[PDB]
Design a protein around this ligand. Sequence first.
Ligand SMILES: [Zn+2]
Ligand SMILES: [Zn+2]
Length: 55
Amino acid sequence: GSSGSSGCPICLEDIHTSRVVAHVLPCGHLLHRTCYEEMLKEGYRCPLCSGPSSG
Ligand SMILES: [Zn+2]
Ligand SMILES: [Zn+2]
């Protein structure tokens, strides 16, 4: 379950700035320097910010 839509939608693990760097998306979300590199390859953008048909 997930009540708060605040967290890396890639790995789904509470991000910890202190622990590791967080990539602030241009939409208003945080990611993991690593994850941000994975999603880019796959071909999917912020799966949280609903968009058009695609995505
Ligand atoms: Zn992540
Ligand atoms: Zn977003």
